[PDB]
């Protein structure tokens, strides 16, 4: 065995050991330098979050991609270093999670980093849009990952997910929080997009939901006050949040925030439809949700409903008889939040003592850009 | 007449441990509180925080000392007391609407969780995977389920729904138990087989209960009726229309006597005369010489009874459903009350049980 795992989030690092059932360490993906003179020259994770009002802090992960390889080194030194895992990297195998649609420049540089600067004996790069399917038992299916920065989509047939089937919607968590601020502004509350982003993010998490039928949620919003709810701000002031609860997340499905494109359901439909007739069937009954922005109450129902509406008036061209036959599965298990680690932990465990799986230091020393075995 | 106000919001559901020292309740939220009694005082000892929506069912497996919970977050947890702390294990109900009610079987080898989408989930523990598996009983269910009670054999299972009818199903799981010996209900009991179905026109079904020996099932509907079928009389259905507001909870206290509670906010007795085949109203159990006086209601109501709001659940504290001597009621007033039957018989002398 002697393996390890690492899902480097944009927010949080989740690392542990092969065959773990929970991540043995979770902490912020953070790297703070001090501004003045037990503070060290640099602080990482828990320590750095604790003293955040005294350090100029950097996230080397921007939107799931690495931007700063220097700070990223310090963050990897922390994970492996005493205060978390306390391991000799040179006597360990390690499985990492390739970011959704990451340009191979980065993909390479990490393999280079892992072997050159840490000297692991074994390394592997699992896909984040697939490992997320091995937890629920899948090999060929679609993944709707809506998180903070962006909402990606990638179907993977028999493990390997084709490069060209992956698309993005530049609408997710930050953009909805941002939009809810605008809506509370039009309700007559003087919020600020910058200053009150965190306060409104928590209002969003606490109170927003996805409407199943807009024409009905607006009738409720407009004809009744059961959507009206009080919310007490940090300063003590109480505000009323009503129809903006469902209007804010509606941006995912709809131009409402000046963004070109179709919206997650129409996008999902259009993507599945551009695939082989035989694999279309198998995609439609293998849709999988993941990430924080899939937790809005009603979301999976709304996606189901919206796909049916498309397939009916965009799949059967005016036909209801055909429609029943429309098999469709959008699985939304209760722990959508973190699975990429759980999948990687199981795979790194069942594959620990194999030989052709782990790309070795022997191999890289010889190079040949064999970092990716397809 | 032993009322205790745990809180002022509802108690959604409750369960007692084996020896009735501890009571688990959901104080109208996502958590379950366990109160142990200390002398005179009730004392909270545990909070079970795992659900992410209102908890709708709690049941306590007496011998294995394991709590199962189910909630509107679509999930169910089997809670296991590890040292000083109840630790939860997530069960994949794989149901796409809220859970509504949950009852362990007598044998404690499996529980039945209510769903929110025309289905009963039968969950058992798989020893090799260390994993809770669950199978679904789908047809001919067509509405939301709303109460469950097991036959003493841990196989037959009664259910009340939004579908206007009480049914008996076989929940026989070959991989965990011996074949069942035939019942008055039938000899063919494969998984999912429909042993009986009620004839009632309309009305929702809020509570259901099997008799002590399991020959008879009784239920209560939202049309202010109570009903009973005994398989000994070819599943003949005895019905009784009430003058008052619907009942929400029912239990046998003897083989031919029932206690029920609902929106009137007090327990009532029903007797079943086996011979004449009819249900009979045995009267008010919760009665206010002193109370007959001014009984001035300190301006803080004016209503009587043990609860100031609908009673949602009623459970047998001792003697089982054959010779029940003590029973428990929890209600939407945040109250839990305890009654004795010998004391009740002293007070109301013109009161006849059986």
């Amino acid at each position: 065995r002697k393996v390890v795992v690492c899902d480097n989030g944009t927010g949080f690092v989740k690392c542990g050991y092969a065959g773990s059932n929970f991540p043995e360490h979770i902490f912020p993906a953070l790297v703070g330098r001090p501004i003045i003179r037990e503070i060290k020259d640099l602080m990482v994770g828990d320590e750095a979050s604790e003293l955040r009002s005294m350090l100029e802090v950097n996230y080397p992960m921007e939107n799931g991609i690495v931007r700063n390889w220097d700070d990223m080194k310090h963050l990897w030194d922390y994970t492996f270093g005493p205060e978390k895992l306390n391991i000799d990297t040179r006597n360990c195998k390690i499985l990492l999670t390739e970011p959704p649609m990451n340009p191979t420049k980065n993909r390479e540089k990490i393999v280079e980093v892992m072997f050159e600067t840490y000297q692991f004996s074994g390394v592997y790069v699992a896909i984040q849009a697939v490992l997320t399917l091995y937890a629920q038992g899948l090999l060929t299916g679609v993944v709707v990952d809506s998180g903070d920065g962006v909402t990606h989509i990638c179907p993977v047939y028999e493990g390997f997910s084709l490069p060209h089937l992956t698309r993005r919607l530049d609408i997710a968590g930050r953009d909805i929080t941002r939009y809810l601020i605008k809506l509370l502004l039009l309700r007559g509350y003087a919020f600020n997009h910058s200053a009150d982003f965190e306060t409104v993010r928590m209002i969003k998490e606490k109170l927003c939901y996805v409407g199943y039928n807009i024409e009905q949620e607006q009738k409720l919003a407009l004809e009744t006050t059961v959507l009206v709810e009080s919310y007490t701000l940090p300063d003590g002031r109480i505000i009323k949040v009503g129809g903006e609860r469902f209007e804010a997340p509606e941006a995912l499905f709809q131009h409402l925030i000046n963004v070109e494109g179709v919206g997650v359901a129409e996008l999902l439909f259009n993507t599945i439809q551009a695939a082989d007739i035989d694999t279309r069937s198998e995609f439609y009954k293998h849709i999988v949700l993941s990430g924080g922005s899939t937790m809005y109450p009603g979301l999976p129902s709304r996606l189901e409903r919206e796909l049916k509406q498309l397939y009916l008036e965009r799949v059967l061209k005016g036909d209801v008889e055909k429609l029943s036959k429309f098999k469709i599965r959008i699985e939304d298990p209760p722990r959508r939040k973190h699975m990429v680690f759980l999948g990687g932990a199981v795979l790194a465990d069942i594959m620990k003592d194999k030989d052709n799986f782990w790309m070795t230091r022997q191999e890289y020393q010889e190079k040949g850009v064999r970092v990716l075995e397809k | 007449m032993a009322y205790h106000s745990f809180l002022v919001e509802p108690i959604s559901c409750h369960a007692w441990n084996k020896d009735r020292t501890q009571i688990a309740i959901c104080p109208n939220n996502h958590e379950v509180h366990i109160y142990e009694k200390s002398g005179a005082k009730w004392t909270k000892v545990h909070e079970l925080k795992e659900h992410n929506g209102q908890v709708t069912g709690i049941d306590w497996a007496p011998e294995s000392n394991r709590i199962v919970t189910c909630g509107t977050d679509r999930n169910a947890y089997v809670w296991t007391l590890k040292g000083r702390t109840w630790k939860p294990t997530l069960v994949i109900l794989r149901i796409n609407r809220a859970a509504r009610c949950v009852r362990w079987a007598p044998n404690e080898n499996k529980f039945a969780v209510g769903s929110g989408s025309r289905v009963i989930s039968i969950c058992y523990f798989e020893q090799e995977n260390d994993w809770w598996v669950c199978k679904h009983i789908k047809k001919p269910i067509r509405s939301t389920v709303l109460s469950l009670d097991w036959h003493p054999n841990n196989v037959l299972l009664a259910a009340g729904s939004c579908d206007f009818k009480c049914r008996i199903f076989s929940a026989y799981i070959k991989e965990v138990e011996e074949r069942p010996a035939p019942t008055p209900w039938g000899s063919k009991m494969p998984f999912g087989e429909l042993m009986f179905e009620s004839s009632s026109s309309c009305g929702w079904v809020h509570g259901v209960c099997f008799s002590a020996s399991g020959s008879r099932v009784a239920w209560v509907s939202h049309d202010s009726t109570v009903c009973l079928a005994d398989a000994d009389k070819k599943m003949a259905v005895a019905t009784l229309a009430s003058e008052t507001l619907p009942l929400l909870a029912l239990t046998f206290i003897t083989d031919n006597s029932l206690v029920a509670a609902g929106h009137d906010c007090f327990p009532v007795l029903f007797t079943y005369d086996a011979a004449a085949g009819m249900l009979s109203f045995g009267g008010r159990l919760d009665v206010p010489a002193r109370e007959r006086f001014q009984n001035l209601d300190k301006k803080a109501a004016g209503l009587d009874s043990l609860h100031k709001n609908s009673v949602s659940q009623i459970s047998v504290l001792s003697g089982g459903k054959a010779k029940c001597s003590q029973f428990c009621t929890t209600g939407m007033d945040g109250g839990m009350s305890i009654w004795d039957v010998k004391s009740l018989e002293s007070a109301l002398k013109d009161l006849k049980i059986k």
């Binding site: 038992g137 899948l138 090999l139 599965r329 795979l347 | 994949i92 598996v133 199978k135 000899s187």
Partner: peptide
């Protein structure tokens, strides 16, 4: 191996799709 034991871990979810005497 993987696809050998991974199938049994999914069959518990997919499911979604002698008496006489």
């Amino acid at each position: 191996g993987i696809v050998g034991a991974l199938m049994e871990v999914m069959q518990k979810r997919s499911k979604a799709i002698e008496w006489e005497d």
